[PDB]
Design a protein around this ligand. Structure first.
Ligand code: ZN
Ligand code: ZN
Ligand code: ZN
Ligand code: ZN
Ligand code: ZN
Ligand code: ZN
Ligand code: ZN
Ligand code: ZN
Ligand code: ZN
Ligand code: ZN
Ligand code: ZN
Ligand code: ZN
Ligand code: ZN
Ligand code: ZN
Ligand code: ZN
Ligand code: ZN
Ligand code: ZN
Ligand code: ZN
Ligand code: ZN
Ligand code: ZN
Ligand code: ZN
Ligand code: ZN
Ligand code: ZN
Ligand code: ZN
Ligand code: ZN
Ligand code: ZN
Ligand code: ZN
Ligand code: ZN
Ligand code: ZN
Ligand code: ZN
Ligand code: ZN
Ligand code: ZN
Ligand code: ZN
Ligand code: ZN
Ligand code: ZN
Ligand code: ZN
Ligand code: ZN
Ligand code: ZN
Ligand code: ZN
Ligand code: ZN
Ligand code: ZN
Ligand code: ZN
Ligand code: ZN
Ligand code: ZN
Ligand code: ZN
Ligand code: ZN
Ligand code: ZN
Ligand code: ZN
Ligand code: ZN
Ligand code: ZN
Ligand code: ZN
Ligand code: ZN
Ligand code: ZN
Ligand code: ZN
Ligand code: ZN
Ligand code: ZN
Ligand code: ZN
Ligand code: ZN
Ligand code: ZN
Ligand code: ZN
Ligand code: ZN
Ligand code: ZN
Ligand code: ZN
Ligand code: ZN
Ligand code: ZN
Ligand code: ZN
Ligand code: ZN
Ligand code: ZN
Ligand code: ZN
Ligand code: ZN
Ligand code: ZN
Ligand code: ZN
Ligand code: ZN
Ligand code: ZN
Ligand code: ZN
Ligand code: ZN
Ligand code: ZN
Ligand code: ZN
Ligand code: ZN
Ligand code: ZN
Ligand code: ZN
Ligand code: ZN
Ligand code: ZN
Ligand code: ZN
Ligand code: ZN
Ligand code: ZN
Ligand code: ZN
Ligand code: ZN
Ligand code: ZN
Ligand code: ZN
Ligand code: ZN
Ligand code: ZN
Ligand code: ZN
Ligand code: ZN
Ligand code: ZN
Ligand code: ZN
Ligand code: ZN
Ligand code: ZN
Ligand code: ZN
Ligand code: ZN
Ligand code: ZN
Ligand code: ZN
Ligand code: ZN
Ligand code: ZN
Ligand code: ZN
Ligand code: ZN
Ligand code: ZN
Ligand code: ZN
Ligand code: ZN
Ligand code: ZN
Ligand code: ZN
Ligand code: ZN
Ligand code: ZN
Ligand code: ZN
Ligand code: ZN
Ligand code: ZN
Ligand code: ZN
Ligand code: ZN
Ligand code: ZN
Ligand code: ZN
Ligand code: ZN
Ligand code: ZN
Ligand code: ZN
Ligand code: ZN
Lengths: 149, 150, 150, 152, 150, 150, 150, 150, 149, 152, 150, 150
C-alpha cells in the first residue's frame, strides 16, 4: 500500500543523500567545483523531498523509519564504501543509476496512489518524478548520452 | 452539485473559517499564547490565499462567487460560535481541528467531483489545498498529543 | 455609547468593508482593471490590518470583540449588496468612496469620544486611521474627477 | 494509431515562440490610455510564457525528444497565426488578438492534457495543467479588461 | 514636576527595566523557554529603542539625561531584585507584568503632564510608547491566563 | 489665517528649503565634506517627503497647493541667497540651522492652529514633523559645539 | 555660449521641470490617476538625479551652478503656469511632452556643443540623458495615441 | 542604408541569435554541460535585453521594428541551422563564436553609420553592445584555447 | 590520532542528524511548533558541522566514511527505533544526552589536537564545542535544570 | 588557591554594562565637527559591546555560573569607572575616556585569556581572544583618530 | 605608442594606485580618520575594478597585460613612496589628488589616441573612467578647500 | 624573527599572491575557463581580505606594514613570473597550488611563533587563515586529480 511505499522511499532517500555526500567529498576532476556545488544543490533538494515524504507519511497516519538500521534494512538503493580513487564519470554514472531507480519506483508509486485514490501523494510523487526526470536529462547530457540511453 | 457550486461553497467555508481563525487569534489565553498567536496569523494568511485562489478560479470558469457576509452565512457549512464564556486553548484547538477535518472531507469530495467532470485544473488545485490541510491536521493534532487520524 | 462598543462597531464595519473590497476585487470590469485590481488588494491588506489593530486594541482595554459573521452583520453600520447585475467601474468606485466617507465620519466621532473620556491611545490610533482614510478619499475621488470634499 | 506526446510538445514550442514574438508586437506598437500598465504587463507575460516555452522544451528533451530550434521550424509547425504590423490599431484590437491566441493555447493545451492522460504520462499532464491554469486566469483578466465575461 | 524631570525619571526606569529583561532573559527555566527567550530579546530591543528616543528627545528640548548607573538607581522608581533563589516562569512573568503596569501608569501621568505644559511632541511620543506597553500587557497577561485589566 | 493657507505657506517654505539644501550640497568645502554631503542628501530626501505629504494633506482637506516657483517665491517666508563669494562650512550650517529654527517656530504655530480648529490629523502630522525638526536642530547645533537652545 | 553656461541653463530647466512634475503629480484627475501618479513620482526621482549629476558635473569642470529659485527663474527657458482652473489629464500630459521636447532639442544642442569643444565626458553624459528623454517621449506620446515624432 | 534599416536588421539578427542560443542551450552535451548551460542562459538574458533596447530605441526615433518571425528570417544576416545530427561542444561554441564575430563586424559598421548620420545616441548604444560582444568573444575564444583575434 | 577521531565524529554526527529527524517527526506536545523549527535549525547546524569535519578530514589527507554501514559500525552515538508515542521531555533528554556525549568527545579531541600540534582542527573543535555547550545550556534550561545537572 | 573563571566572567559582565552606559554618555553629550560620524560610531560600538556582554553572560551560564542581573551588582563589582556629565567636554576628551576604558578592558581581557588558558577552558579562551582582537582594532582606530600611535 | 601599450601602462598605473590607496588606508591619522578610511576602501574597490576592466579590455584586443609587480614598477608612471616619517591627513589627500590628476591627463591622452585609431569601445570606457576620476578630483579638492581646477 | 616581521612578510607574500591570482585570472585558457575565472575572482577577494586583516592587525600591535610594490618585492618570499610563453591550465593551477603550499608552511611557522610569544590573537587569526588555505589546497589538488598531500 501507500504507507509501505512511502517508508521504503524514506530509506531510499536517506541512503541516496548519504551517497550524494560520498560523491560530494571524493570527486576529482576538471568539473570539480561545478559538480561540487551541484552536489550540494542535490543534497538540499532530495533532503527536502525526504522531509516532505516523511511528513506526508505522518499526515496519513503512518510511522516513518527514523534510524540508520531501519534505513539499511529496508532501502533498495545500493551503497558502496569508497576504497580507491574513482573518476568523475563513474560517480556520475552511479548517481544517474540511482536517479533511474527512483524514477521507476516513483512511477510505480504514482500508479499505486492513483488506484488507491490518494490524489495528494499522487500529485506529490508526480512533481518529485518531474524533478528527477529533469535531473536525469541534465546528468545524462553531462555524460554525452541521450536521456533514454 | 457541480464544480461551480462546490467552489462557491468553499468560498463561504473559507471566509467563515478565516473569521474563526481571527476568533481564536483574539480570545486565546494560555502558556502557548505567542506561538499560537503568530501561528493563527499564518493560518489566516494561508487560507485567505486559498479563498482568493478559489474565488478567482470560479471566475475563470465563468462563475460568480459569493461576495457578502450574508451569502457566506447562507451557504457555508462551517459552524461559527460567538465568544461568550471563557474557553481553554485545547478547546479552541479542537474546534480548529474539527473545521480542518470538515474542509478535508469536503475537499476530498471536490477532488472526486472535479475528477468526474474532467476539470483537471480545479482537481490539481484542490489536491494542493488538501495537501496543506492534511499537513495542518497532522501538526495541530500532534500539538494536542493525538494521532493525525484520531 | 462608550469606547469599547465603538471599537467593536468598527471591527464589524471593517470586516464588512474588507468583504466588499474583495467584491470589487473580483467583479470589476473595464479599462482600468489591473490597476484597481492590485489597488483593491492593497486596500484589503491595509483595512484588514486596521481591523486587526482595532480588535486587539479593544482586547487591550478589557473588552470583547465580535468574532463571527453574524455579530458583524448585526452590528455593522456599513451596507453590503450582493452582486447580481453588472455594474461599471465608476459605480464600484462610488460605493468604495461612500464607505470611505462613512468610516471617515464614524472614525471622527470615535476621535471625539475617545478624546472626551481621556483615552489618548485609541485617540491617536483613530487619528492615524482617519489620516489614511482621508488620503484614500482624496485619491479615489480624484480618480472619479471630483474634489475630495465633493 | 494515436499521435504521441513529443509532436504535441514541439508543436507547443513553436506556438509559444510565435506567441512571445506577438507579445513583443503588442509590447511595441501599443497606444492608448493604458500604455504603461499594459506595457509592463506585456513584459510580465513575455517572461511568463518564455518560462513556459523553456520548461516545455526541456520536458520534451527529458522524454528523449528533440525540440525545434530554428525560426523556420517554428513558423512551419506553429498553429498560432502572426500578422506584421502595418496599420495603426487600437488597444482593444491588440488585446483581442492576445485573447484569441490565449484561447487557442488554452484549447490546444486541453487537448494535450487529454492526450497525456491517455498515454499515461502524468508529468506532462500536470505541467500542462499548471500552464492551462495560468492561461485561464489570464483569459479571465484580459476579457475583464475588455468589459467581457471570461467565457464571452 | 515638569517634562524634563519626568523624561529623565523614565530614562532610569527604562534602564532598570532593560536590565530586568536581561535577568529574566538569563535565569528563565520552563517549558516556554525558547519562545519567551526570543520574546525577551524583542522586549530588550523595543524598550531599549524607547529609552534611546526618550533620552535623545530630552536632549532635543535642551535637557540633560542621566548617563550613569548611579543616577539611574538614584532616580528610578522601578524596583530591581538580584537573583538568588530559583523562581518559576509565571513568577518572572508576574514581575515583568508589574513593571509594565508601573510604566503604564507613570506614562499616563507623563501624558497628562506634557499636555499640561503644552509639549505636544513628547505627549504623542508617550502616547505611542504607552500604546505598545498596553498591547504587551494584554499579551503577557493573556500568557498567564488573566484578563488584561486583572 | 486658517489651516489651508498655513499648509501652502509651509509648502513654499519646504521647496525653498530643499533648494537651499542643494546650495549647501554643492558649494560646501572643508574637512567634513563627505559626511555633510551624504547628510545633505538625506535631508533633501526627508524634507522632500515632508513636502509631498504636506501638499497631499492639503489636497485631502480640499485645498489647492502652490505648484510653481513663482508662487513659492510669492508666499515663502524663508530667505534664499544666491551663491557669489565662497562661504565656510560653519556659515552654511548656521543658515541651515536658522531655517530649521524658522520651520520649528512656524510648525509650532501650525500645531496651535490645527489644535484650535479641531483638525487632529494635521495636528499629529505636524507633531511628527516638529519632532524630526527638533532632533535635527539638536544634531546640527551639537555639530557646531552649541547647546540645542542656543 | 560655452559648456558651463549651458549646464547651468539645464540646471534651471531641470528644477522648473521637476516642480512642474509635482504640479501634475498633485492636480491630476481622471481614470488613469494612480498609474500616472506613481509614474510622475518616478519622473521626479529620475530627473532629480539628472539635475544633481548635471550640477556636480558643472562643478567638476570648475563651474558654479545656480543654487536659488531666483536664479532658476532668471535663466530657465522652460515655462511654468500657476494652477488656477482645473485641467484635464491629456492637457497635463501635453505640457509634460512639450517640456520633454524642449529638453530634447536643447540637450541635442548640448551634444553638438560639447562634441565641438572636445568635452567627451559631458558628451557621453548628455547622450545618455538624451536617450532616456527620447524613450520617455516615445512612451508618453504613445500614451496619447500619437506617433513619437508628432 | 540608414539607421532605421540597420537597427531593424540587427533586431532580426538578435532574434535568430537568441533562438540559436536556445539551440545550443538544449542540444549541448559534454563535460562542460552545466557551466555552459547556465552561461547560455546568461547569454539569452543579455542579448534578449539588447534586442529589446534596440527595438525600443528604433521606436524612439519614430521607426517601426519587425515584429514577426517571417520578417526576422527575411531580413536577418545570421544563419540558422536545424539540429539533425549530434555535434560536439567545441562545434557549437565555434558556431556561437562565428555569430558573435558577425555581430561584432556588423555592429562596427553600425557605429560608423550612426556616426555618419549624426545619431550619437544609437552610436553610444552600439558602442556598449559591441564592448560586451568583444568581451564575450575573448572569453569564449579562450574557452576554445584560441587567441581573441584568431 | 586526529583522523580516526574526525571520522568517528563523522559517524556520530550522521547518526545524530538522523536522531534529530526522529525528534523532528515524532514529537507531540504544547511546544510542538517551537521545538519543530528548533529541530530544523539543529539539523542544519550539525549538518554543517559534519560537512566541515569531513572536509577537514579530507584536507589533512584522510578518508571519511561515506556509507550508512560504516556509520553504524563506527559511531558511538546510540539510536533507538521509534515504537510507541513518547513525551516531549523524553525526546529532549535523549537530545541533551547526545549533546553531552559530543561535548565530552569533542573535549577529548581538543586535547588530542592540542598535543599533536594541529591548531586548525583544535580551534574548529573549540568553536563546535562552544555551540554545543550553548545548546546544552538552552535545552537543559528548557527541562528546568542547571547546565551542570 | 587560584581565582576561577566565573568570577572573572561576571566581573566582565559588570564592566561591559558600565561600558555600554558610558558609550551612551558619549553618544548623547558629544559636540564637535565629528558629531555624526562618531554618533553613528557610538551606536555601532554600543551594539558590538552589547553583543559581547550578552555572549559573556550566556557563556557564564553555560559553565553553570550566575551572572549579575541588577545595576547594584554591576556598580559594586565593575572595575570600570563612570563619571556623570557635568561640565561640557571636547570631542578629544570623550574619546580619551573611551580609549581609556578600551585599554582597561584590553588588559583585563588579557588576564582572562591567561586564566582560561591556565584552567584549561579553551572555549572562554577563544571567545576572549576574539573580543580582545576587536578591542585592539578599536584602540588602533580611535588612537589614530586622536593623531596618536595605537600603543601611545 | 598605440592602444595596447597604453592599456598596459594604465594597468601598471592602476595597480600602483591601489597599493597607494591601501597606504593611506593604513597610515592615516587625524580627526577625519573613519570617513577617509571607509572612503579609501571605496576607492580601492573602484579603481581595482577599473584595473580589471582595463586589463581584460587589453586582452579583448589581443594584447598581453602586465601581470607581475616587477612589470608594474617598470612600466608605471605613478610614483610611490614608502611610508617612513608621519604625515598629516591633508598631505595624504594631496598625494591622492596628484595621482588623480595624473590619471586624468593620461586618460585624456588615451581618449585622444583611441579616438584617432577608431577604437570607439576603449574610447567610451576611458570616457567613463575619466568621468568618475573627474568627479573624485572635484570631491577631494573640495575636501582640501580648493577649486577642482586649482 | 618575531610576530611583526612575520606579519609584514605575509603582507608582501599576500600582495604578490593576489597579483599572481590576477595573472592566472587573465591569461587562462581551456575548457574550464569560466569556472576558474570566477573562482580566481573569489580567491582574489578572499586573500585580499586576508591581506587587509593582516596589515590592520600589524597596525594594532603598533607595527608599520609595507605599503609599496618596492617593499613587497623586496621582502616577499613568493615568486612571480611575467607571462611570456603560453601555458596550460594545469600549469597555472600547479603554480597556484605551489604558492598555496608555501603560504601553508609559512603560516604554520607563524602559528608556532605566535604561540611561543604568547600572542593568542594573531595565533587564532593565522589559525583561521591556515584553515582556509588548507581547504583550498585540498580543492585545487582535487581539481588536478591529486591527493591533498601530494
Ligand atoms: Zn546552488
Ligand atoms: Zn538540482
Ligand atoms: Zn530536513
Ligand atoms: Zn521538516
Ligand atoms: Zn515540518
Ligand atoms: Zn524498492
Ligand atoms: Zn482518483
Ligand atoms: Zn490525476
Ligand atoms: Zn504538484
Ligand atoms: Zn565524460
Ligand atoms: Zn453548498
Ligand atoms: Zn504547558
Ligand atoms: Zn496580534
Ligand atoms: Zn511563522
Ligand atoms: Zn501553517
Ligand atoms: Zn484577496
Ligand atoms: Zn486577488
Ligand atoms: Zn487576482
Ligand atoms: Zn458542504
Ligand atoms: Zn480528464
Ligand atoms: Zn498543483
Ligand atoms: Zn494540552
Ligand atoms: Zn480606455
Ligand atoms: Zn475607463
Ligand atoms: Zn500596489
Ligand atoms: Zn492604499
Ligand atoms: Zn488578521
Ligand atoms: Zn493579528
Ligand atoms: Zn452598536
Ligand atoms: Zn454605526
Ligand atoms: Zn468614467
Ligand atoms: Zn464633533
Ligand atoms: Zn481611458
Ligand atoms: Zn519598455
Ligand atoms: Zn510586473
Ligand atoms: Zn501575468
Ligand atoms: Zn529561455
Ligand atoms: Zn533553460
Ligand atoms: Zn535549463
Ligand atoms: Zn495545433
Ligand atoms: Zn496514471
Ligand atoms: Zn499538480
Ligand atoms: Zn504541477
Ligand atoms: Zn474597451
Ligand atoms: Zn509543557
Ligand atoms: Zn519574534
Ligand atoms: Zn514584543
Ligand atoms: Zn543608542
Ligand atoms: Zn542614538
Ligand atoms: Zn525621581
Ligand atoms: Zn514615578
Ligand atoms: Zn502558568
Ligand atoms: Zn490632543
Ligand atoms: Zn497643548
Ligand atoms: Zn546616512
Ligand atoms: Zn536626517
Ligand atoms: Zn515628490
Ligand atoms: Zn507623491
Ligand atoms: Zn501621494
Ligand atoms: Zn503668508
Ligand atoms: Zn567649525
Ligand atoms: Zn502620531
Ligand atoms: Zn514604476
Ligand atoms: Zn520613467
Ligand atoms: Zn539631490
Ligand atoms: Zn548629490
Ligand atoms: Zn554627489
Ligand atoms: Zn540662457
Ligand atoms: Zn485622453
Ligand atoms: Zn556611455
Ligand atoms: Zn572532463
Ligand atoms: Zn553566471
Ligand atoms: Zn555573459
Ligand atoms: Zn521585452
Ligand atoms: Zn520593453
Ligand atoms: Zn537586410
Ligand atoms: Zn549586414
Ligand atoms: Zn576542446
Ligand atoms: Zn564620438
Ligand atoms: Zn555626430
Ligand atoms: Zn530557524
Ligand atoms: Zn540552534
Ligand atoms: Zn552537507
Ligand atoms: Zn560541502
Ligand atoms: Zn565543500
Ligand atoms: Zn566514541
Ligand atoms: Zn601547539
Ligand atoms: Zn591555542
Ligand atoms: Zn574558531
Ligand atoms: Zn518539562
Ligand atoms: Zn574639524
Ligand atoms: Zn541618534
Ligand atoms: Zn555603522
Ligand atoms: Zn566598530
Ligand atoms: Zn542583549
Ligand atoms: Zn540573548
Ligand atoms: Zn540568548
Ligand atoms: Zn578587574
Ligand atoms: Zn588545552
Ligand atoms: Zn578561534
Ligand atoms: Zn573564535
Ligand atoms: Zn584631536
Ligand atoms: Zn576636528
Ligand atoms: Zn581635521
Ligand atoms: Zn562609503
Ligand atoms: Zn569613490
Ligand atoms: Zn580583480
Ligand atoms: Zn575579473
Ligand atoms: Zn610604456
Ligand atoms: Zn606614463
Ligand atoms: Zn586641514
Ligand atoms: Zn589632446
Ligand atoms: Zn621575511
Ligand atoms: Zn576536459
Ligand atoms: Zn573577468
Ligand atoms: Zn563563486
Ligand atoms: Zn575559495
Ligand atoms: Zn583593503
Ligand atoms: Zn580596511
Ligand atoms: Zn579597516
Ligand atoms: Zn619567508
Ligand atoms: Zn599564552
Ligand atoms: Zn578565529
Ligand atoms: Zn587536468
Amino acid at each position: 500500500d501507500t504507507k509501505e511505499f512511502l517508508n521504503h522511499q524514506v530509506a531510499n532517500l536517506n541512503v541516496f543523500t548519504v551517497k550524494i555526500h560520498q560523491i560530494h567529498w571524493y570527486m576529482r576532476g576538471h568539473n570539480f567545483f561545478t559538480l561540487h556545488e551541484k552536489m550540494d544543490d542535490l543534497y538540499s533538494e532530495f533532503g527536502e523531498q525526504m522531509d516532505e515524504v516523511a511528513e506526508r507519511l505522518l499526515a496519513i497516519g503512518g510511522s516513518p523509519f527514523s534510524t540508520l538500521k531501519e534505513f539499511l534494512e529496508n532501502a533498495s538503493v545500493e551503497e558502496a564504501p569508497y576504497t580507491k580513487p574513482k573518476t568523475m564519470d563513474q560517480l556520475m554514472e552511479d548517481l544517474v543509476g540511482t536517479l533511474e531507480l527512483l524514477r521507476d519506483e516513483y512511477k510505480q508509486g504514482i500508479e499505486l496512489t492513483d488506484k488507491e485514490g490518494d490524489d495528494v501523494t499522487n500529485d506529490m510523487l508526480i512533481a518529485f518524478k518531474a524533478s528527477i526526470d529533469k535531473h536525469i536529462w541534465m546528468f545524462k547530457a553531462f555524460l554525452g548520452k541521450a536521456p533514454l540511453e
